[PDB]
Write a protein that binds this DNA or RNA. Structure first.
Ligand SMILES: Nc1nc2c(ncn2[C@H]2C[C@H](O)[C@@H](COP(=O)(O)OP(=O)(O)OP(=O)(O)O)O2)c(=O)[nH]1
Ligand SMILES: [Ca+2]
Ligand SMILES: [Ca+2]
Ligand SMILES: [Ca+2]
Length: 341
DNA sequence: GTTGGATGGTAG
DNA sequence: CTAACGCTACCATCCAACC
């Protein structure tokens, strides 16, 4: 069938531009301030103006402020971005009811029965692009191909404010030419390990004997690269169900003291149980980011769903568990709920 | 020798 | 305080329980 992929352009940043258009065309940086000191924290994202000077997601707000001291630094308003996202995802639903909301900013439509060929798909893509640009002022990039992965790849090639169709014949061309690093699911750690095996594109995966591919990346990514490269890979647009909900916050200073940390842990619990919204988790994990940025987690699965009261007292037992079992001072603390009924 | 649970890594 | 927030899917690993 034919998959159409939407990825909203510089999302949090753009939304801020829609809310304050006197920002458009000059560098905008959306940050998560951590409160540890003046301008501590990270950059959630940045518009392309900012992005031209290396201000991207994940870098400290202070590294960015040295590069672009005069840029606009805006604190992250996820509540707001989520509202816009929700509305756009709802727009998308009126184009195909076979939707998979993949993330806050991306979604896959299976348009197979709304269009006859890729050319009709492209026009639909333009229809969708305008409709969003008209109803939400957000530019997005559309990637259309035979399936999820490739449609995502097309979007990655056209962004920002782009549209790429990757026809059955174009698919084949990329397998041989696309950098494996650009394959969805292939990050730096996997890229590195694949380059260690002479694997640069997809192609060289069909070259390498399966046996030593899983013997570097595990069974899953191995199957994944191959089905992609053999032009099989069908994965259907399945309606997303949220499997875990969590919240994790940053402390004013690293601490090992149970009492200093609790208020942070509870803040997260409260936030999490709120985001849960009618969902009853049977599992809770307290997650701690150490001083050296290792992420550790202690958790517990219950025979039956967890009440907020249970969450509270178990989280503490779990934080105790982390504190006794891990030497390091904790920097960030939070909780995550899974296994909903 | 699967399925579930706890914990950690990877990636987007 | 001294730079590194936030989220969630899926997978890997280990091991204990177990049909
Ligand atoms: N707090 C935080 N938010 C992030 C981070 N990475 C991404 N996000 C949020 C902000 C982004 O606007 C949003 C969508 O992620 P994308 O990967 O699609 O990047 P973005 O849309 O900003 O650029 P776009 O034109 O596709 O490239 O997700 C991160 O490291 N931290
Ligand atoms: Ca995206
Ligand atoms: Ca995006
Ligand atoms: Ca990559």
């Amino acid at each position: 069938g034919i998959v159409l992929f939407v990825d909203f352009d510089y999302f949090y940043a753009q939304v801020e531009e829609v809310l304050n258009p006197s920002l458009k065309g000059k560098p905008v940086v959306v940050c998560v301030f951590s409160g540890r000191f003046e301008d501590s924290g990270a950059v959630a994202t940045a518009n392309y103006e900012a992005r031209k000077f290396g201000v991207k997601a994940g870098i400290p707000i202070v590294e960015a402020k040295k590069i672009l001291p005069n840029a606009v630094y805006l604190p992250m308003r996820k509540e707001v971005y989520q509202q816009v996202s929700s509305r756009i995802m709802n727009l998308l639903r009126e184009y195909s009811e076979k939707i998979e909301i993949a993330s806050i900013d991306e979604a896959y439509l299976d348009i197979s029965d709304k269009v006859r060929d890729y050319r009709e798909a492209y026009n639909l893509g333009l229809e969708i692009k305008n409709k969003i640009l008209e109803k939400e002022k957000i530019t997005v990039t559309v990637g259309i191909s035979k399936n999820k992965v490739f449609a995502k790849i097309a979007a990655d090639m056209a962004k920002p404010n782009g549209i790429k169709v990757i026809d059955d014949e174009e698919v084949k061309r990329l397998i041989r030419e696309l950098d494996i690093a650009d394959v969805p699911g292939i990050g730096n750690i996997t890229a590195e390990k694949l380059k260690k095996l002479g694997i640069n594109k997809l192609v060289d995966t069909l070259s390498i004997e399966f046996d030593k591919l899983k013997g570097m990346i595990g069974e899953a990514k191995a199957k994944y690269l191959i089905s992609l490269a053999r032009d099989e890979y069908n994965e259907p647009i399945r309606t997303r169900v949220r499997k875990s909900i969590g919240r994790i916050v940053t402390m004013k200073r690293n601490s090992r003291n149970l009492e200093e940390i609790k208020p942070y842990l509870f803040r997260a619990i409260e936030e999490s149980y709120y985001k849960l919204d009618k969902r009853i988790p049977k599992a809770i994990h307290v997650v701690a980011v150490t001083e050296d940025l290792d992420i550790v987690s202690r958790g517990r699965t219950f025979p039956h769903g967890i009440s907020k009261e249970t969450a509270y007292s178990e989280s503490v037992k779990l934080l105790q568990k982390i504190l006794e079992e891990d030497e390091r001072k904790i920097r960030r603390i939070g909780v995550r709920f899974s296994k909903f009924i």
